[PDB]
């Protein structure tokens, strides 16, 4: 009876609600009439118990280098009904430590699986279709989710779907990222960088486009449960290029703002890096070159896109920028 024990095993592996647990072991549907109506399938109890016993035994058997160990742990746990209940029926985004610990490997694995099932795929699609990858950064291999938000301007709460159109109002002030890491990585020593690039600003000299780096964080510390990049966490030492908002010029297409997240190269403590904050040209910016220089590995990405609107002038004024150019409606 290993799943009943909670000495070494974290407390998150159990269902925190007691009633539910009781129901499971010998319901939730709140309304009384509805409950009355409900009629579960026969012989569920004994068979379920037997199954539990079997799986528990298996887990015990499983129970005994780091990555391998983690994998083993995951294997042992996954079939626990309680853990499944916790994961499936509680929110993974705004995670709550005790219900779902991403410190715990099983939960992390589950999260990864979930991501693979949908969100990751969606992100990939958005990248491919909108020509984010080949245009800015050759390729990526998903690794970790990255969800952005724009809480400060306007005041509303929404996780941005990849490849959305945001109003200039919404993207007036900086965003918040949540880099949900998986894959058994170090937490103390591993640092991250985050770059919001937009590759389609009009170059009149060449007649093509040039890529601007509108926001740049480096040397961020992350944790499996604690990963929201709010002004609380990063401090002014970590910003290499402070936030500039999307201010598309009229008839300059739809500008794609693509947030990239990279993990630092790993050598005792947390390894930092200087990045000549002054020297680095942000107005025109080579992402690939930058990566080559500091040997980054892009883990995750997200993307949105902005268009001109009446509001942008005001935004520009607020930020103390030029009045903004205007382009001919024809693609001559």
């Amino acid at each position: 009876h290993i799943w009943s024990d909670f000495t070494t095993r974290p407390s998150s592996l159990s269902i925190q609600s007691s009633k539910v647990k009781n129901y499971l072991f010998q319901p939730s549907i709140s309304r009384r009439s509805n409950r009355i109506k409900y009629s579960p399938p026969e012989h569920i109890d004994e068979i379920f118990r037997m199954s539990y016993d079997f799986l528990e035994q298996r887990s015990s058997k499983f129970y005994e280098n780091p990555l391998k160990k983690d994998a083993l742990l995951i294997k042992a746990e996954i079939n626990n009904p309680e853990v499944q209940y916790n994961f499936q029926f509680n929110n993974k985004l705004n995670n709550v430590k005790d219900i779902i610990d991403y410190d715990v490997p099983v939960y992390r694995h589950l999260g990864k699986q979930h991501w693979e099932s949908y969100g990751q795929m969606l992100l990939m699609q958005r990248l491919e279709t909108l020509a984010a990858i080949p245009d800015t950064l050759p390729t990526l291999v998903p690794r970790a989710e990255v969800n952005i938000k724009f809480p400060f301007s306007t005041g509303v709460n929404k996780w941005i779907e990849p490849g959305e159109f945001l109003s200039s109002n919404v993207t007036s002030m900086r965003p918040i990222f949540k880099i949900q890491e998986y894959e058994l990585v170090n937490v103390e020593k591993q640092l991250y960088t985050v770059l919001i690039v937009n590759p389609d600003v009009p170059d009149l000299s060449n007649d093509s486009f040039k890529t601007a780096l509108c926001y740049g964080l480096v040397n961020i510390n992350l944790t499996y449960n604690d990963n929201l990049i709010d002004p609380r966490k990063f401090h002014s030492s970590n910003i290499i290029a402070d936030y500039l908002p999307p201010v598309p010029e009229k008839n300059a297409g739809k500008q794609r703002f693509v947030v990239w997240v990279f993990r630092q190269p790993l050598i005792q403590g947390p390894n930092m890096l200087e990045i000549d904050r002054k020297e680095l040209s942000r107005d025109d910016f080579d992402i690939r070159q930058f990566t080559k220089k500091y040997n980054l590995t892009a883990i995750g990405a997200h993307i949105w896109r902005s268009e001109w609107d009446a509001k942008v002038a005001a935004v520009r004024e607020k930020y103390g920028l030029p009045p903004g150019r205007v382009f001919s409606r024809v693609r001559r």
Partner: protein, 52 residues
């Protein structure tokens, strides 16, 4: 001056047009089906302010 036939029957025509406009969407819905109508209703309900 009496006014040209087309010039005197103008206001009435306009009124008729307005009336038609008022009762055109419904007609379209009817032509289409019930599902379409339902969809339209849903859209109307939506409650989503855009931007300019």
């Amino acid at each position: 001056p009496k006014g040209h036939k087309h010039e005197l029957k103008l206001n009435e025509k306009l009124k008729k047009r307005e009336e038609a406009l008022k009762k055109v969407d419904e007609l379209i819905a009817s032509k289409k089906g019930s599902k379409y109508a339902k969809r339209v209703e849903k859209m109307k309900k939506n409650q989503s302010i855009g931007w300019f």
